[PDB]
Amino acid sequence: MIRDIIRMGDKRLLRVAPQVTNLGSAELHALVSDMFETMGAAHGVGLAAPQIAVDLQLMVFGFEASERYPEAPAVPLTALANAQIEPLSDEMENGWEGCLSIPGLRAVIPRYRYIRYRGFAPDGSPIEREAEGFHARVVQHEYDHLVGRLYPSRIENFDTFGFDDVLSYDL
Amino acid sequence: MIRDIIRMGDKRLLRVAPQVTNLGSAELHALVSDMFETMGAAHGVGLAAPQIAVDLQLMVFGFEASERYPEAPAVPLTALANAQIEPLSDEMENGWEGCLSIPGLRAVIPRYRYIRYRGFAPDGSPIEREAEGFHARVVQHEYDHLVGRLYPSRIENFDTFGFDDVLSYDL
Numbered sequence: 192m193i194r195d196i197i198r199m200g201d202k203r204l205l206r207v208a209p210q211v212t213n214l215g216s217a218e219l220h221a222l223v224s225d226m227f228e229t230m231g232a233a234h235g236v237g238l239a240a241p242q243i244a245v246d247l248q249l250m251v252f253g254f255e256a257s258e259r260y261p262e263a264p265a266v267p268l269t270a271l272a273n274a275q276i277e278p279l280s281d282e283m284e285n286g287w288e289g290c291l292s293i294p295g296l297r298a299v300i301p302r303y304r305y306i307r308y309r310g311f312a313p314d315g316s317p318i319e320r321e322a323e324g325f326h327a328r329v330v331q332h333e334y335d336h337l338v339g340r341l342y343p344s345r346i347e348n349f350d351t352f353g354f355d356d357v358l359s360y361d362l
Numbered sequence: 363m364i365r366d367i368i369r370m371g372d373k374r375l376l377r378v379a380p381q382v383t384n385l386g387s388a389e390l391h392a393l394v395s396d397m398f399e400t401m402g403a404a405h406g407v408g409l410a411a412p413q414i415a416v417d418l419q420l421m422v423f424g425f426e427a428s429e430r431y432p433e434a435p436a437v438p439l440t441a442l443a444n445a446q447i448e449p450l451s452d453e454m455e456n457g458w459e460g461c462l463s464i465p466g467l468r469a470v471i472p473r474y475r476y477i478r479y480r481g482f483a484p485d486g487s488p489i490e491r492e493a494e495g496f497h498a499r500v501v502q503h504e505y506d507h508l509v510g511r512l513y514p515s516r517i518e519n520f521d522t523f524g525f526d527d528v529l530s531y532d533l
């Protein structure tokens with residue numbers, strides 16, 4: 192089932208989400224399957240549970256081909272609960288992000304180039320990966336939703352923030 | 363004539379505009395008359411020349427009744443060239459702003475409660491006023507366009523930035 196994506200300004204995107212405690216259940220699997228489905232209809236690359244007004248530490252992400260980022264390499268289709276993230280280095284890198292909760296807009300945002308992330312697949316097996324570049328950016332961005340944080344509060348150069356069909360900033 | 367309002371992301375909103383040097387002319391009066399007209403069709407309270415892709419230190423503003431700010435007091439209908447602004451005190455005050463170049467969105471923004479502003483009416487007589495509260499906020503906000511600055515770069519609390527029809531932050 193496709194769920195409404197709530198838009199920036201809803202208080203529900205501003206909460207600290209509690210942990211997922213129903214790993215391996217049929218309710219989690221249905222909620223995850225709804226998320227991939229919702230992500231896909233909106234042509235997302237990442238979607239976090241609080242974006243559909245579900246207060247949980249859960250995110251889906253990944254794709255082969257992105258309509259929005261035709262230059263990005265495949266990121267594996269992933270559902271991750273109870274995400275924890277550690278930078279593997281201090282190197283930052285700028286890149287364009289948008290967000291299905293902030294339709295029409297984008298900005299350049301600095302993110303760690305290299306991370307490890309850990310948590311659980313919805314069946315409850317542990318997931319643990321090193322990620323870099325766009326894969327890492329997607330995960331950091333979706334994690335931010337689980338702590339009530341959207342990308343505008345991370346913009347350093349406001350010249351790069353604008354509507355997607357009007358911008359000609361060259362990164 | 364109603365002119366297109368260019369949207370955030372256009373480089374033309376990011377320039378430092380030169381001064382108006384055709385005070386009292388028929389070209390300025392036509393451009394000003396276009397601005398009030400454009401402001402009015404979009405239900406604006408302020409419009410700055412760079413918002414219609416005109417690179418000049420010129421802004422129009424004011425209204426009796428605002429559809430957008432039904433709680434605001436009348437601000438006189440004003441066209442101002444070569445605006446210069448000085449705070450009359452250090453007191454800041456938060457208030458909701460939006461912007462016709464960033465449709466659909468609003469945020470709370472701190473501004474000086476008290477200013478003086480000076481410049482010229484389009485006929486070239488000097489204008490010099492003390493302003494406070496919403497009147498002062500409008501003028502400071504439009505001035506920012508004349509230096510290539512939009513309101514997101516002024517937001518301090520990103521919880522208050524969201525779409526107009528979804529927000530329930532209580533100022």
Ligand SMILES: FC(F)c1nc2ccccc2[nH]1
Nearest residue numbers: 235237288289290291329332
């Ligand atoms: F525009 C949206 F499709 C969107 N969602 C994202 C999630 C992470 C990084 C970039 C993103 N862009």
Ligand SMILES: FC(F)c1nc2ccccc2[nH]1
Nearest residue numbers: 406408459460461462500503
């Ligand atoms: F939403 C728009 F109509 C708009 N334009 C503005 C100009 C100054 C202050 C607040 C404003 N809000």
Ligand code: NA
Nearest residue numbers: 205206207339
């Ligand atoms: Na919060």
Ligand code: NA
Nearest residue numbers: 376377378510
């Ligand atoms: Na600039």
